[PDB]
Amino acid sequence: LCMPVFHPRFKDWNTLIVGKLSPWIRPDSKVEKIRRNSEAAMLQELNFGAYLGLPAFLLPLNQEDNTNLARVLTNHIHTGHHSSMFWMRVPLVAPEDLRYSGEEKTWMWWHNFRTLCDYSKRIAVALEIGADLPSNHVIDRWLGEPIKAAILPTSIFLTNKKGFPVLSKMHQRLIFRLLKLEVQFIITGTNHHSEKEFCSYLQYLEYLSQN
Amino acid sequence: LCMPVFHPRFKDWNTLIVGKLSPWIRPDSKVEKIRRNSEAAMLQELNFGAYLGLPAFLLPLNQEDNTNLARVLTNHIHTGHHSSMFWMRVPLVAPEDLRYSGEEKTWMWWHNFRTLCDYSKRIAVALEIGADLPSNHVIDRWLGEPIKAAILPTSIFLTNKKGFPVLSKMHQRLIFRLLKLEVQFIITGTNHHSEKEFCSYLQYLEYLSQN
Amino acid sequence: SRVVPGQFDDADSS
Amino acid sequence: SRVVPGQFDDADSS
């Protein structure tokens, strides 16, 4: 099962498909059996994605240790039948933090995995944005990394006087910094959201392009 | 809400997105009010599709008269903000027939609409296959038309001794005639179908490419 | 998909 | 996605 990415056609949107690893898959579960089941299921799904020619595949990392996830992935690349781009889904801020080990934690997560895959050009990041935002020294660090996309939940938009979704001022400054890299966009939480309502989130982001 | 088309990468699959008109939309309902509501909703959805850059849009025709559907569509093209390809979803055989007015009926449907849009190069057909198949004189007629895609329900596949989906011999001869035009494919009925099971339908079609 | 006046205005509240 | 022997064989029944 897949997911739609939206890439701004302004340098007018464009839409493409990326695959998503089933959520129950946890290659680094403390438990032995889950590791084996998950390592198996991950390859099933990576090859199904390559078979469909999906241009990228979304793999989540939300803990310190991802040795198992790195290995299965390196193995799958070696075969030669690969979607040829892998976007690691990483939170800008750790969710457990909100009810260098500080705000730079999730960066280390990525950086460590990045080095485990020998700085593979096939591996990039899909950054997940929350309500809390970290400092600028850590925002700077992330912007050196290869971000292909940004993941924005509907829950971080405010509604304005007129009743439409808009980004907080802090959040606006961040996003603008992301449309400078031409990233693609993913919007989560479209559940219970009419297709005419979901359209406005994109309208706003297109407006935000000129600010 | 959208739909995935699969285009064979052999001349190895490829996947793209086409939009689908909401089903409750019936621009030629006998009832007045539905016509007005549907004519309005159709344009909402066509423009949402153009805004996302969807390469094609699926519009169903399953009756004789489609004057309303042709007009709204011609109007939407004139604006200039259009997905730039429209695939009309037409049954090879009328479903009401199975519990020139004969087996050529659904062709006339298309041909009549085709002429209402002044043989617009933006308008093509997405042909829907059932269990019943019509003669060859009518199959010939259709193959002169511009078929961009073929719609195949899981329900028309047999299972073979080994327990996998395969096409009836009659159905195999038809499909082969369709992979000669390089059409794209759409598979309906993926409900209650594991992603590993759905993968086999495509495997079969890729095999069928060499027969 | 037809933009209206004030669509993109800032939330004058949080 | 690993093809097995007889995967594509014809239905010897309808």
Numbering used by the authors:
A (entry chain A), B (entry chain A): 41 to 51, 77 to 164, 179 to 290
C (entry chain B), D (entry chain B): 1 to 14
What's the publication's text?
Target selection depends on adaptor proteins which bind to PRMT5 and recruit specific substrates to the PRMT5 active site. We report the characterisation of the interface between the TIM barrel of PRMT5 and the adaptor proteins pICln, RioK1 and COPR5, and identify the consensus amino acid sequence GQF[D/E]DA[E/D] involved in binding.
A co‐crystal structure of a RioK1 derived peptide with the PRMT5 TIM barrel domain confirmed the results of our mutation and truncation studies. The protein structure shows an unusual seven‐stranded β‐sheet with one antiparallel strand for the TIM barrel which is not observed in other PRMT5–MEP50 complexes.[ 3a , 3c ] The conformation was confirmed by anomalous density maps using both the sulphur anomalous signal of Cys and Met as well as a platinum anomalous signal after soaking of the crystals in potassium tetrachloroplatinate solution. The reasons for the difference in the core structure are presumably the missing MEP50 interaction partner as well as a shortening of the PRMT5 construct. A significant part of the groove is positively charged and seems to interact electrostatically with the negatively charged end of the peptide, whereas the remaining area of the binding site is hydrophobic.
